[PDB]
Design a protein around this ligand. Structure first.
Ligand SMILES: Nc1ncnc2c1ncn2[C@@H]1O[C@H](COP(=O)(O)OP(=O)(O)OP(O)(O)=S)[C@@H](O)[C@@H]1O
Ligand SMILES: [Mn+2]
Ligand SMILES: [Mn+2]
Ligand SMILES: [Zn+2]
Length: 512
């Protein structure tokens, strides 16, 4: 009926939480979003991996009168929210181009007459065949954009069909909007807001730390043996192993099977009833292990293995973010080889030059720098999302075996002072040439040869300077700007090192 369930909205949220979704307390972020959403103020909600984002629009939808529309690109999961929501008495529905015309009209007719409270619609469907015009007669009280980084060319998963979502604000000037995402760095967060035309929204950015996940890496070397010994050492704990090919999945699954490990294969070339069996056997812990391509929200996954490295940190974060959703101790292990990053680079550098290849090259490079990190793996991930932190976690493979340290105060001011001195406009190599005092026309053309930093670092190698700055980006003192061609930029945390007010310990850069 689209009828508000409670009389007092304030105490309504937590009423519903407990009485309708059975939970006991709100997860930080959650109340503030929900109260803001009931108030009618636009929002951008950035909740970490499996942090509880759907509740943020489901609870307000249950407490308001009218139709809440939820847009999502994940057809075949949207359907599965519908059914569980219907299970719990919640009057949900979805509407995509994958339905039959008869079935789409029936969902239109329940929105028309207010038998549907919550409507999950694919982006493409929402802008086609004058849907907005019909949507305007159904008392629409709230539009939620899920997966909202998908509208940005700067994120890791731009989808062209979300583009047209920038028309809705204009069409629906009193319609409150919320934009939800679990994966979007600063640029992308900023872009989401601009493109959807969020009106002075509350921007709530939860933390990205999952502290119960330990991040590890293993340098490949007879990797199949390494992958079998790794699994063995898990001593029965549940897991997902990610591979980039259907034959890697299929073959690994068979080898595990052959050693008495209850392991199955998952990928697109399985039949819809077979995937769902796989998923369900995994959900209940009938299977220890699922070997898969990039396609289950199980709360108790103990380990996530990446056999091949992802093309970006965003993907690496969502994929490892599947382990340990119950909050108990879990682990992510990435098997890496520097040749694997030379492949991807080769692959990428003969795709059509331009804007898109750049966005892709910056994101690959930052994935590549995480893998070759000499700094806490958790700090790399948080400072990549803009959650600037300098305290090592103590629960990742670099922190379990720290690299030899040296006082880097002098190295860091040199590097921090060059970046500021060149007006924060230049990428890593140019800066490093200025630090080393190369004989470069470009340098002479900009007069950087005249600077006092020019050549202060000549006695150390290009790789030394590369590591220093990479350690500064990993620690949150320096960002690489993706919208300015990866220009090295200074953050507030640089201030005390840059002033000489505080010392800084860095790893002695590795000889490679
Ligand atoms: N306050 C809460 N207390 C307990 N369980 C909760 C709470 N909020 C949500 N849940 C659960 O948290 C889980 C995931 O929340 P979702 O919204 O489905 O994940 P998400 O944060 O949106 O995930 P990603 O990053 O997109 S994968 C589900 O088990 C629940 O609905
Ligand atoms: Mn409240
Ligand atoms: Mn979600
Ligand atoms: Zn650490």
């Amino acid at each position: 009926m689209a009828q508000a369930e409670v009389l007092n909205l304030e105490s309504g949220a937590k009423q519903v939480l407990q009485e309708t979704f059975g939970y006991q307390q709100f997860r930080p972020g959650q109340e503030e979003i929900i109260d803001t959403v009931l108030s009618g103020r636009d929002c951008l909600v950035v909740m970490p991996t499996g942090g509880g984002k759907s509740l943020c629009y489901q609870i307000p939808a249950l407490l308001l009168n009218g139709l809440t529309v939820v847009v999502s690109p994940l057809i075949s999961l949207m359907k599965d929210q519908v059914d569980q929501l219907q299970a719990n008495g919640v009057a949900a529905a979805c509407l995509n181009s994958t339905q039959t015309r008869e079935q789409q009209l029936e969902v239109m007719t329940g929105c028309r007459t207010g038998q549907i409270r919550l409507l999950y619609i694919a982006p493409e469907r929402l802008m086609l065949d004058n849907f907005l015009e019909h949507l305007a007669h159904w008392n629409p009280v709230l539009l939620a954009v899920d997966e909202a980084h998908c509208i940005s060319q700067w994120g890791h998963d731009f989808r062209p069909e979300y583009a047209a979502l920038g028309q809705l604000r204009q069409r629906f000037p009193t319609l409150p909007f919320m934009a939800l995402t679990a994966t979007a760095d600063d640029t992308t967060r900023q872009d989401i807001v601009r493109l959807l035309g969020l009106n002075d929204p509350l921007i709530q950015i939860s933390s990205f730390d999952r502290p119960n996940i330990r991040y590890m890496l293993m340098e490949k070397f007879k990797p199949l043996d390494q992958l079998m010994r790794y699994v063995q050492e898990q001593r029965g704990k549940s897991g997902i192993i990610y591979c980039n090919s259907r034959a890697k999945v299929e073959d690994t699954a068979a080898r595990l099977q052959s050693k008495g490990i209850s392991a199955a294969a998952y990928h697109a070339g399985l039949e819809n009833n077979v995937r769902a069996d796989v998923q369900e056997k995994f959900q209940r812990d009938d299977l220890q292990i699922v070997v898969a391509t990039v396609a289950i929200n199980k709360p108790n996954v103990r380990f996530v293995v990446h056999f091949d490295i992802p093309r970006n940190i965003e993907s690496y974060y969502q994929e490892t973010g599947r382990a340990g959703r119950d909050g108990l101790p879990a682990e992510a292990m990435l098997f890496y080889d520097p040749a694997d990053m030379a492949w991807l680079r080769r692959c990428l550098e003969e795709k059509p030059q331009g804007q898109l290849q750049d966005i892709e090259r910056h994101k690959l490079n930052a994935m590549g720098a995480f893998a070759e990190a000499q700094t806490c793996r958790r700090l790399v991930l948080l400072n990549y999302f803009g959650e600037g932190r300098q305290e090592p976690c103590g629960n990742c493979d670099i922190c379990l075996d720290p690299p030899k340290q040296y006082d880097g105060s002098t190295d860091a001011q040199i590097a921090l002072s060059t970046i500021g001195r060149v007006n924060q406009r230049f990428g890593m190599g140019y800066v490093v040439e200025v630090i080393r005092g190369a004989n470069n026309q470009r340098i002479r053309d900009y007069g950087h040869d005249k600077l006092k930093v020019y050549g202060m670092g000549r006695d150390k190698s290009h790789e030394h300077w590369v590591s220093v700055i990479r350690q500064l980006i990993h620690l949150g003192l320096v960002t690489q700007n993706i919208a300015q061609h990866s220009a090295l930029q200074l953050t507030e945390a640089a201030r005390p090192v840059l002033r000489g007010e505080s010392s800084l310990q860095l790893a002695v850069p590795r000889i490679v």
